Coordinates of C-alpha atoms in Angstrom, one line a residue:
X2 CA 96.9 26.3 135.8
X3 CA 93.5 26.3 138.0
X4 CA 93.8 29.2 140.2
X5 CA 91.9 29.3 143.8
X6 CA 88.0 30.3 143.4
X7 CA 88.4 32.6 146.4
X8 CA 91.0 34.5 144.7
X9 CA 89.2 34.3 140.8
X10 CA 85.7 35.5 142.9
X11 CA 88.1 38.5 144.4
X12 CA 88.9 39.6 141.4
X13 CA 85.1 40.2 140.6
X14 CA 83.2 43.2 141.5
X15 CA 80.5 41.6 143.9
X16 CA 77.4 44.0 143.5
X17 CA 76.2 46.3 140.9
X18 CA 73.0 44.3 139.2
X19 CA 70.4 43.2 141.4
X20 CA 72.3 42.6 144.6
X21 CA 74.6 40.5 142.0
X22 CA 77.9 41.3 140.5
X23 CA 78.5 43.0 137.2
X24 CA 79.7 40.1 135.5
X25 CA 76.1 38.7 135.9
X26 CA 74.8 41.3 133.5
X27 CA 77.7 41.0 131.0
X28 CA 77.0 37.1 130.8
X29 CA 73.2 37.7 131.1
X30 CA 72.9 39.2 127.8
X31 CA 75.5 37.7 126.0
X32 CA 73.9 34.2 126.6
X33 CA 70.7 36.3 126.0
X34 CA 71.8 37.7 122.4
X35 CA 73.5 34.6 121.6
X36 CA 69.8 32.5 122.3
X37 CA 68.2 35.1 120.6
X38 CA 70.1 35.3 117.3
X39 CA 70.3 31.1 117.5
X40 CA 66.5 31.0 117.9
X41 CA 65.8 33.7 115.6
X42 CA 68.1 32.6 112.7
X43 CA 66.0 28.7 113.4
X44 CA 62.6 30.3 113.2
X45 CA 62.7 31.4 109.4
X46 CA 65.5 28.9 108.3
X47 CA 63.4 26.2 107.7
X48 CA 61.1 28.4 105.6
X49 CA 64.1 29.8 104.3
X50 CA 65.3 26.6 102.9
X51 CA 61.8 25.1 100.7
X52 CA 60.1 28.0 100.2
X53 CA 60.0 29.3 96.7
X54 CA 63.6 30.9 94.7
X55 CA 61.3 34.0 93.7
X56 CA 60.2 34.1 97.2
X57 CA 63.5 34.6 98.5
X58 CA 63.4 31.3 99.4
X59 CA 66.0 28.5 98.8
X60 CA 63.7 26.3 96.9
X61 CA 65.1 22.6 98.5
X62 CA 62.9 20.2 98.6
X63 CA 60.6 20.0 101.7
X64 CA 61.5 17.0 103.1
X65 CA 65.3 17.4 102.9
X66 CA 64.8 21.2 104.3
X67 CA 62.7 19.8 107.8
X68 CA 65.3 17.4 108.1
X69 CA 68.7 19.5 108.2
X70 CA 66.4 21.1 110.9
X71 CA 66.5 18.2 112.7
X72 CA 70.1 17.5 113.0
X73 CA 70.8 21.1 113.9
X74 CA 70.4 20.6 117.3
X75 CA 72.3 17.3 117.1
X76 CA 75.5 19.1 115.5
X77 CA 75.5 21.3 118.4
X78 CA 75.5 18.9 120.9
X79 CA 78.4 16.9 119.5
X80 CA 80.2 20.2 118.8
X81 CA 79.6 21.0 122.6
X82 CA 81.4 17.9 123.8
X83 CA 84.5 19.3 121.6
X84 CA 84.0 22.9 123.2
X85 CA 83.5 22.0 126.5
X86 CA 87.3 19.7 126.3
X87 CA 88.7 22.5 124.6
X88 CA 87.7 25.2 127.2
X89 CA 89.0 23.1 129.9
X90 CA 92.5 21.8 128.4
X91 CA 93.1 24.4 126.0
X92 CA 91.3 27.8 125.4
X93 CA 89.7 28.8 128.9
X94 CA 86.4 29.2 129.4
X95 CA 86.7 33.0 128.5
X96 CA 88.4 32.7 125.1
X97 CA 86.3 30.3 124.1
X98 CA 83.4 32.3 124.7
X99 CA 84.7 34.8 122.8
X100 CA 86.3 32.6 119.8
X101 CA 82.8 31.0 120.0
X102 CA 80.7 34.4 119.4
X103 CA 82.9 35.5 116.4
X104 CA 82.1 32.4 114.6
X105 CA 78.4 32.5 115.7
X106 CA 78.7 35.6 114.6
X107 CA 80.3 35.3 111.0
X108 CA 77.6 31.8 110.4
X109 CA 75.0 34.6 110.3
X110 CA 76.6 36.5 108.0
X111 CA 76.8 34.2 105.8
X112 CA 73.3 34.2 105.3
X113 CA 72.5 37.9 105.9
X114 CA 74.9 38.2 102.7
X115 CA 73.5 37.4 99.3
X116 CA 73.9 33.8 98.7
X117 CA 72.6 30.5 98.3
X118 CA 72.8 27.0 99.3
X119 CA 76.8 26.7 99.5
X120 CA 75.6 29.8 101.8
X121 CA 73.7 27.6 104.2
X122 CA 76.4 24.8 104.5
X123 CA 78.7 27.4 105.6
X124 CA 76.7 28.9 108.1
X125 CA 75.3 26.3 109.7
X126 CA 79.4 25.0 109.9
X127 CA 80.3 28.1 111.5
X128 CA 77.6 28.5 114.1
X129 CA 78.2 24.5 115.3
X130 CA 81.3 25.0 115.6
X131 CA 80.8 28.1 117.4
X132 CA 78.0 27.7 119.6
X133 CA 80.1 24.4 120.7
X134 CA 82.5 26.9 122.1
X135 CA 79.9 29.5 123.1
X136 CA 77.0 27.4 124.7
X137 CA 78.7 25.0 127.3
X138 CA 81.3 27.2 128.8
X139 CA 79.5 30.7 129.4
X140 CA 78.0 29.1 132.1
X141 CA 81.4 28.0 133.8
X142 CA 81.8 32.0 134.0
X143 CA 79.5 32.8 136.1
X144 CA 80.2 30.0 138.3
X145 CA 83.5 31.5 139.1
X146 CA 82.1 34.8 139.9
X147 CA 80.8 33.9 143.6
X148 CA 82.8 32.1 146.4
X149 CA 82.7 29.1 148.3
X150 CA 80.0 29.5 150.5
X151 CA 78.6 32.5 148.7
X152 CA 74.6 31.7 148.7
X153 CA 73.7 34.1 145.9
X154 CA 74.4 31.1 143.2
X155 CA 71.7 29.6 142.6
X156 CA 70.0 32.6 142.2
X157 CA 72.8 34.0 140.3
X158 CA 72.0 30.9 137.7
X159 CA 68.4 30.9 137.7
X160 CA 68.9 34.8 136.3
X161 CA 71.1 33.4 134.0
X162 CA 69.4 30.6 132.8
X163 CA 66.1 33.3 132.3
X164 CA 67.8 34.6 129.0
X165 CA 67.5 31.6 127.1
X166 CA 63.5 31.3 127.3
X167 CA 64.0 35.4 127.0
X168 CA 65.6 34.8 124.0
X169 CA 64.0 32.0 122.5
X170 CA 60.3 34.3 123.0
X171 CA 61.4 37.4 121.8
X172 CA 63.5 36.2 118.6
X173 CA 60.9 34.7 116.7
X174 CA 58.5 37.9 116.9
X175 CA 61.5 40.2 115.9
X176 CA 63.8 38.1 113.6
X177 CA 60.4 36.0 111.9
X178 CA 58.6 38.9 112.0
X179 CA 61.2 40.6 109.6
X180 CA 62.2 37.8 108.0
X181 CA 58.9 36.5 106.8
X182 CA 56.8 39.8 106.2
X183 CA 60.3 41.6 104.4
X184 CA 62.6 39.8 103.5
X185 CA 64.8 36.4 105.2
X186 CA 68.6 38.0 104.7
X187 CA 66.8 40.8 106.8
X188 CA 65.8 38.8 109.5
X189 CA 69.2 36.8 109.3
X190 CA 70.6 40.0 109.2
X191 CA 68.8 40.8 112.4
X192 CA 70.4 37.4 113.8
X193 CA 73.6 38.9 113.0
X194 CA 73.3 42.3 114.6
X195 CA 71.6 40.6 117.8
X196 CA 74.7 38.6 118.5
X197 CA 77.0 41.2 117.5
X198 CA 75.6 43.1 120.8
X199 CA 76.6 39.6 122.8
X200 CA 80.2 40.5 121.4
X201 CA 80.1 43.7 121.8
X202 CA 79.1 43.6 126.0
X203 CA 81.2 41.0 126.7
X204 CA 84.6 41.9 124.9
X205 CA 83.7 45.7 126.1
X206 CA 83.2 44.9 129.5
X207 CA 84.8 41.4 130.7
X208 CA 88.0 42.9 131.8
X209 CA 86.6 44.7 134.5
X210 CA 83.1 42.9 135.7
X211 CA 85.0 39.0 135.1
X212 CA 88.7 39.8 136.1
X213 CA 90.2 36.8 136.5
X214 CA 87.3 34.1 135.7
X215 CA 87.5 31.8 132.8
X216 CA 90.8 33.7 131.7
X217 CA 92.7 30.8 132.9
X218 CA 93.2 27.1 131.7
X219 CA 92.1 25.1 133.9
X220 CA 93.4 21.7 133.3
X221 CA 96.3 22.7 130.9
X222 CA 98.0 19.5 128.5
X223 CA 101.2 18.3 129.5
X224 CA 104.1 18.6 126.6
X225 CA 103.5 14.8 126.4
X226 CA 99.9 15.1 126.1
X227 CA 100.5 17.9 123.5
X228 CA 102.7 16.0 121.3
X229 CA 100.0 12.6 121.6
X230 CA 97.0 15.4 120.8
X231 CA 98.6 16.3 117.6
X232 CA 99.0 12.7 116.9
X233 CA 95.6 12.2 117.1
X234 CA 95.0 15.3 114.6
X235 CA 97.7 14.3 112.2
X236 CA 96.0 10.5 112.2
X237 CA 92.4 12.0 111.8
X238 CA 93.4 14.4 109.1
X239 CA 94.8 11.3 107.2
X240 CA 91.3 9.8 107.8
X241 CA 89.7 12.8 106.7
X242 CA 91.7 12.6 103.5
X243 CA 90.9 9.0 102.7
X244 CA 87.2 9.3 103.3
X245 CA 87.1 12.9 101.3
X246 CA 89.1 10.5 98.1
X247 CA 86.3 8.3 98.5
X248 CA 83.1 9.6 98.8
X249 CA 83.8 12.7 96.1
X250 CA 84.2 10.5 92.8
X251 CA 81.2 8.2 94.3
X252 CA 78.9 11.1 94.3
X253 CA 78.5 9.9 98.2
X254 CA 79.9 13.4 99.8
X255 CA 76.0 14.9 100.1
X256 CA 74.1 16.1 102.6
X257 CA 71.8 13.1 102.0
X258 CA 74.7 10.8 103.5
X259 CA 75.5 13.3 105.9
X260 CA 72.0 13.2 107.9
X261 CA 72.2 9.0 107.3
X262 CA 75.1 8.7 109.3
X263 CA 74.1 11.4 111.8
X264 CA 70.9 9.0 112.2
X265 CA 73.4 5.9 112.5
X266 CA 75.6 7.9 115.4
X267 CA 72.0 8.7 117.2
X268 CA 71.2 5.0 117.8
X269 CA 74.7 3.6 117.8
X270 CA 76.6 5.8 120.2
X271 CA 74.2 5.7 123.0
X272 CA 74.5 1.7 122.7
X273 CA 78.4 1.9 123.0
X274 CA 77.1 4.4 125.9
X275 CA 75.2 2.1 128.2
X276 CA 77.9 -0.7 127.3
X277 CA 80.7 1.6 128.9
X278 CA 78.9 2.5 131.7
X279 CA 78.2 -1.4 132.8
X280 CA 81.2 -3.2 131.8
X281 CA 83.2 -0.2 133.1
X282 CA 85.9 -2.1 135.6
X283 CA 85.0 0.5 138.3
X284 CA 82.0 -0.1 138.6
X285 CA 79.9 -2.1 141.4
X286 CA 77.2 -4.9 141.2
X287 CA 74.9 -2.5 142.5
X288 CA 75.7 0.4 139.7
X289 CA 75.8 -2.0 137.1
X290 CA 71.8 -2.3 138.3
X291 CA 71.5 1.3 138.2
X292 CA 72.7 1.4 134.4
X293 CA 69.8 -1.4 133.3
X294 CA 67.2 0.8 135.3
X295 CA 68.7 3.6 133.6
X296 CA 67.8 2.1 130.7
X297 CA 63.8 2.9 130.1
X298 CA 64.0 6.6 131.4
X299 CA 66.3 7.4 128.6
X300 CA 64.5 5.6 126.2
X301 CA 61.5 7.6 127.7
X302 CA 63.6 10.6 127.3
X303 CA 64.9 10.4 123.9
X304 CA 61.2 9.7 122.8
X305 CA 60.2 12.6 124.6
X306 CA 62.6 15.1 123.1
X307 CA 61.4 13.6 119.9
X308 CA 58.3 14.7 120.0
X309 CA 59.3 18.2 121.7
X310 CA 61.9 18.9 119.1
X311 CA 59.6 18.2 116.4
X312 CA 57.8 21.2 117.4
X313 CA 60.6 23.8 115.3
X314 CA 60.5 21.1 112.7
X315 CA 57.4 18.8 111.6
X316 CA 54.8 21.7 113.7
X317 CA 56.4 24.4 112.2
X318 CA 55.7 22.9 108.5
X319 CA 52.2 22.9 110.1
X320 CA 52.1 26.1 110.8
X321 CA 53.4 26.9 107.2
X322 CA 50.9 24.4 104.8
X323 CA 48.5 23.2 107.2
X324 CA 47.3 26.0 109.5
X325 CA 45.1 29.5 108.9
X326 CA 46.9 31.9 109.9
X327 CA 44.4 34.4 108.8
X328 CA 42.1 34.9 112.2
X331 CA 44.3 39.4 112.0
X332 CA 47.3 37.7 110.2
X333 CA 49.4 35.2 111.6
X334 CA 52.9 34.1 110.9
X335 CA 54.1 31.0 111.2
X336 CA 58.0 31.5 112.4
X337 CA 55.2 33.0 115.6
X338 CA 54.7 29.4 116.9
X339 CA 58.2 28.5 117.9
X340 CA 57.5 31.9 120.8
X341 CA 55.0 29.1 122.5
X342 CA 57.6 26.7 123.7
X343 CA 59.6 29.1 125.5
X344 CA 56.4 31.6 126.3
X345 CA 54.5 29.0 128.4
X346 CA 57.1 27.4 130.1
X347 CA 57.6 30.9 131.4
X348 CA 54.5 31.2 132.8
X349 CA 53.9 27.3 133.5
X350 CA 57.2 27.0 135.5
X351 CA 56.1 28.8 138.7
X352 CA 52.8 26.8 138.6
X353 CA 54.8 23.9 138.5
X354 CA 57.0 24.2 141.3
X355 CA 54.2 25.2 143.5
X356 CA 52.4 21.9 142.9
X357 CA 55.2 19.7 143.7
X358 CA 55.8 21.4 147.0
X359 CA 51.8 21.3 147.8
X360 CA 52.4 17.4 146.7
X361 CA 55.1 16.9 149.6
X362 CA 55.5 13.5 149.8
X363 CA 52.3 13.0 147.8
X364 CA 54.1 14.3 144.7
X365 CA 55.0 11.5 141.7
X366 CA 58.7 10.3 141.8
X367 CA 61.4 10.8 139.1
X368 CA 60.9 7.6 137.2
X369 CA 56.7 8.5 137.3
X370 CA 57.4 11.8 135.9
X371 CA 59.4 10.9 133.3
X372 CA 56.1 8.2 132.3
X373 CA 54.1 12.1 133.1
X374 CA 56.5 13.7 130.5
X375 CA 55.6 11.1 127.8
X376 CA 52.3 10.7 128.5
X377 CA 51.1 14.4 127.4
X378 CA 53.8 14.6 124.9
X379 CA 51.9 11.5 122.9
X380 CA 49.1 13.7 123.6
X381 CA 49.9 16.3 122.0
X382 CA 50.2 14.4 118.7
X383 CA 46.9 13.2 119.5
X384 CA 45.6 16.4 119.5
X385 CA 47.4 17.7 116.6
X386 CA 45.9 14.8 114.2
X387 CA 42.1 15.6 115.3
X388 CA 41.2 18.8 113.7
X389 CA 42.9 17.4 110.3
X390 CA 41.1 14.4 110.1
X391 CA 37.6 16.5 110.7
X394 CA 40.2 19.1 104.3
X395 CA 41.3 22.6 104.3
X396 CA 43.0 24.5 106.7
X397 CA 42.2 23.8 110.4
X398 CA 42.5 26.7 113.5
X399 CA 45.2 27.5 115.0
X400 CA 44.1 26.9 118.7
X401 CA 44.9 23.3 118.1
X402 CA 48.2 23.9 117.1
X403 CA 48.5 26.4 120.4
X404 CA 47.0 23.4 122.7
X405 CA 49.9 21.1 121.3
X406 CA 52.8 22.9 122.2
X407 CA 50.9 23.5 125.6
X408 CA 50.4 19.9 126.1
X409 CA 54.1 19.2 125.1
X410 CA 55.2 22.3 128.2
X411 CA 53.2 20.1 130.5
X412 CA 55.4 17.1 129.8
X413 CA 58.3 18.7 129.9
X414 CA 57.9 20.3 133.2
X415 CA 57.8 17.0 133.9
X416 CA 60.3 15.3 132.9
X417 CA 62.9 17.8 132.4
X418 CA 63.6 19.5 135.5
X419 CA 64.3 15.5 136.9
X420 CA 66.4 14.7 133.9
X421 CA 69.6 15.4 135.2
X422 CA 68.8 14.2 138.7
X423 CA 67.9 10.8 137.3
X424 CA 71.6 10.7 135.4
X425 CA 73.3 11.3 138.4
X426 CA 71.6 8.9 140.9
X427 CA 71.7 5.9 138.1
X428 CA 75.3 7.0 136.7
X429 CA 78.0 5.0 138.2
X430 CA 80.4 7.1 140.4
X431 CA 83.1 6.9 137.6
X432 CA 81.1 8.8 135.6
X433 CA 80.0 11.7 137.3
X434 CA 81.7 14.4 135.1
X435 CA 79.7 13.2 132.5
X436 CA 76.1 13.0 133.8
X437 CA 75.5 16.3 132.5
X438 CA 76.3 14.8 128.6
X439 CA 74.4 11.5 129.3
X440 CA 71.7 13.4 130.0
X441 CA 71.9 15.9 127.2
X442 CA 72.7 12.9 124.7
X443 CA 68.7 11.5 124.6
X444 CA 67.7 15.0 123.5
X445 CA 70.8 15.4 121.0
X446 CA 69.7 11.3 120.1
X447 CA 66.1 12.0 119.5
X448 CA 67.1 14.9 116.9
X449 CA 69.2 12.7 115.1
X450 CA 66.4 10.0 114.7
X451 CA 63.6 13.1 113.9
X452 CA 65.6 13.4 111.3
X453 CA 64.9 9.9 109.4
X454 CA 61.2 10.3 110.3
X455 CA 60.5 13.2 108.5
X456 CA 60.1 11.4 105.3
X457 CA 56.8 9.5 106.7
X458 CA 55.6 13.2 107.2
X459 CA 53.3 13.5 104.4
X460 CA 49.7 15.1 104.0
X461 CA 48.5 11.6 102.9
X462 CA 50.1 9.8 105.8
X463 CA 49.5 12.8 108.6
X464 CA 47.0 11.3 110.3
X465 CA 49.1 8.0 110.4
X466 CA 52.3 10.2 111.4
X467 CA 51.0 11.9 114.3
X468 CA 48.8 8.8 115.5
X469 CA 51.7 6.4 115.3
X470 CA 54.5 8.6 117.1
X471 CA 51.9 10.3 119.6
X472 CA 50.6 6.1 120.4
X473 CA 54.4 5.0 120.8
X474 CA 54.9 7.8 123.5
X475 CA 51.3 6.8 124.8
X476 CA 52.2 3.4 125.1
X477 CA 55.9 3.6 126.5
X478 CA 54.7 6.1 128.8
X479 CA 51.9 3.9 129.7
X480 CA 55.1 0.7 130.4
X481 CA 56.7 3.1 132.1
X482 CA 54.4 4.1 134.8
X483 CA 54.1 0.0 135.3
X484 CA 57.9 -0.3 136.2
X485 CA 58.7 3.0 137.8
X486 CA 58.1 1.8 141.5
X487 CA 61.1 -0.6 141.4
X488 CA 63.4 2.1 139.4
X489 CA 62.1 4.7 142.0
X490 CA 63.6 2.6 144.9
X491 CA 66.6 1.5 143.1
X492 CA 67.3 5.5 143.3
X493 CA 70.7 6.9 145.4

């Protein structure tokens, strides 16, 4: 049922905000309202979760509270594999946008509402599922609103892809602000009405600013397919059932085992991965060489993302128990705007340099050894002003997350570029997943560190981590020349 891009982009109004379609505007906020109610809702939940019962707080224990954080992101992910097949063989890219919003939407809810930790399991359940329909295809739409040939695409993403940062600044000084000074079913309240606007402009105004794109199916299942999908369902609920008989009388259905086997599926599904890829019978001699060089950048990667990901986790705990926030008064939900903030600002600087650079610039594999280089920095810099008892200034906490931007300027921007040139042909639909799979990976492994994370073994914690990315980074460098020629 895919229907010819010249015709879907005809359907779209071609001007009307900033030299770009109307449909631009109508996806630029609900991606923007959708990053800003996800970001906001993760800037006071982990707060939300060990912080005191008369505090309005959930009063779980600290350790088991930084670690749900952790798999968060790694839910997503998984649930965005599931969205993205779903989009393209079932829903559209459209309806599952919209599907996708009204369960983001209900997750936060659930914990604007009065409620407790049953509250939490919900919610988080609703906004995976959702934001695996939401997150992956809303960037399909805009694809479809400009034609072959039409040169105002790129741009038309970059705009796009500006929300997100938008978003993920802005939430954390509106939704922590009101979460943390008043109350936290305020702020997640907040979170609610912030995406409700992303329903609101899109269902309101999709008809006529995105016409015809993502309202069609574009690889539609066969009645023979259909009837082997359902028999894939039917044999998975009967799974589900067996495991659920199980685990229940055991006392093994917690959230305990939950973020065990999430950690399992972090290290064991990238292995099955990388096997795939090289014993895949499509494959050439000279691929299956690309897969083993593939090998330490996403190692690198994945240890990277640790470390970066850590920063709305282990950094915010920081900011909570080991940090003066009275320098006026601080809060600490205010340190996950940092991240976001200076990349902002760093970004331009960034892209200047490499094109001053020219040929003189670092190459792929060397920047991904740059990326994990100031990343193990920034642990290195976080442990210093703690080991020099009481509450240490903030401006080392700031310098962290702007070491980690450095890094990631680094290393991200290349990330996919390195998939696809080491990725074997058979497997090009599904660089963009490889890629996104060390940063889903490293969250499910951030998760089974946490428990080392204690103010008697700090110093060790950040030394040991920030020294591993030091010293990987450090291999890295050494062996990047002969991945950098092995490069498509």
């Amino acid at each position: 049922a895919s229907i010819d891009k010249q015709q879907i982009a005809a359907s779209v109004p071609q001007r009307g905000f900033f030299g770009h379609p109307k449909g631009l505007f109508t996806l630029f906020f609900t991606e923007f309202w959708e990053r800003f109610s996800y970001y906001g809702m993760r800037a006071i939940l982990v707060y939300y979760m060990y912080y005191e019962v008369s505090k309005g707080g959930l009063g779980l224990d600290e350790h088991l509270a930084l670690a749900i954080m952790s798999i968060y992101g790694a839910l997503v992910y998984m649930s965005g594999i599931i969205g993205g097949w779903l989009a393209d063989r079932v829903f559209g890219t459209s309806r599952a946008v919209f599907y996708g919003g009204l369960l983001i939407m209900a997750g936060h809810i659930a914990l604007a509402i009065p409620g407790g930790v049953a509250a939490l399991f919900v919610s988080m359940a609703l906004i995976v599922l959702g934001t695996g329909l939401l997150k992956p295809n809303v960037s399909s739409i805009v694809g479809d609103m400009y034609k072959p040939g039409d040169d105002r695409r790129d741009a038309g993403f970059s705009i796009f892809y500006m929300g997100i940062n938008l978003g993920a600044f802005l939430a954390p000084l509106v939704v922590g602000t009101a979460g943390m000074k008043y109350n936290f079913h305020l702020g997640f309240g907040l979170a609610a009405v912030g995406m409700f606007l992303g329903l609101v402009v899109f269902v309101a105004t999709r008809k006529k600013n995105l016409g015809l794109a993502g309202t069609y199916v574009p690889n539609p299942l066969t009645p023979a397919e259909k009837k082997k999908a359902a028999a894939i369902m039917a044999v998975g609920a009967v799974v589900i059932a067996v495991l659920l008989a199980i685990l229940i009388p055991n006392g093994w259905f917690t959230v305990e085992t939950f973020i065990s086997l999430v950690g399992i599926l972090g290290i064991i599904i990238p292995i099955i991965y990388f096997v795939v890829m090289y014993r895949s019978p499509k494959t050439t001699a000279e691929e299956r060489s690309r897969v083993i060089a593939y090998i330490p950048l996403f190692v690198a990667s994945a240890m990277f993302w640790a470390i970066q990901q850590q920063g709305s986790t282990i950094l915010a705990n920081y900011a909570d128990k080991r940090t003066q926030l009275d320098v006026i008064h601080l809060s600490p939900a205010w340190f996950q705007s940092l991240n976001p903030l200076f990349i902002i600002i760093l970004a331009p600087v960034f892209a200047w340099m490499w094109v001053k650079l020219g040929k003189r610039q670092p190459t792929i594999p060397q920047k991904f050894a740059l990326g994990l280089l100031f990343a193990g920095l920034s642990f290195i810099v976080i442990l210093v002003p703690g080991h020099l008892g009481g509450l240490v200034h903030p401006i080392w906490l700031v310098l962290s997350y702007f070491i980690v931007v450095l890094g990631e300027l680094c290393l991200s921007p290349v990330g996919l570029s390195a998939t696809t040139k080491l990725a074997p042909a058979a497997f090009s639909a599904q660089t963009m997943s490889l890629w996104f799979l060390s940063n889903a990976a490293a969250q499910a492994i951030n998760a089974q560190l946490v428990r080392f994370y204690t103010p008697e073994n700090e110093t060790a914690y950040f030394g040991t981590i920030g020294g591993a990315a030091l010293v990987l980074g450090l291999i890295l460098l050494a062996i990047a020349p002969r991945i950098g020629r092995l490069m498509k």
